[PDB]
Amino acid sequence: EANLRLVISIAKKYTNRGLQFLDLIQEGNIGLMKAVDKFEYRRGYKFSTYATWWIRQA
DNA sequence: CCGCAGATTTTTGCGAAATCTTTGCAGCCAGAATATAATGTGTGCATGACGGCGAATACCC
Numbered sequence: 396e397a398n399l400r401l402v403i404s405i406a407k408k409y410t411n412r413g414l415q416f417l418d419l420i421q422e423g424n425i426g427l428m429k430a431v432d433k434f435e436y437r438r439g440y441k442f443s444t445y446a447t448w449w450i451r452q453a
Numbered sequence: 454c455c456g457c458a459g460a461t462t463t464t465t466g467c468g469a470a471a472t473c474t475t476t477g478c479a480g481c482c483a484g485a486a487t488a489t490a491a492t493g494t495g496t497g498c499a500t501g502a503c504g505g506c507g508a509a510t511a512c513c514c
Contacts (some may be wrong), residue, residue, distance in 0.1 A: 404492055444489065448489080
């Protein structure tokens, strides 16, 4: 819930290139949950960086 | 008007290949796995008929 803004901001870049924005943010939320399930801080990286690639893939 | 020849009919035989399932192959394809920097924002709003009409809140008397 706290990271939905990242999904919205990322998806609005892809909205100008066709496809509904709402579907994009829903898929990005799916990818965000996938990243959350796989996130760790033992790596030392920022969560936003890790979630960015997941959201882009979704 | 009848028996054989031309034409037509009867019968046995071999090659050919195609099809159905199985096996090996290659292009297609799906999910699973990895850790680059990026979170209150974008956004389309495109816009000058005309008549009828009930529904939905407002407001005077």
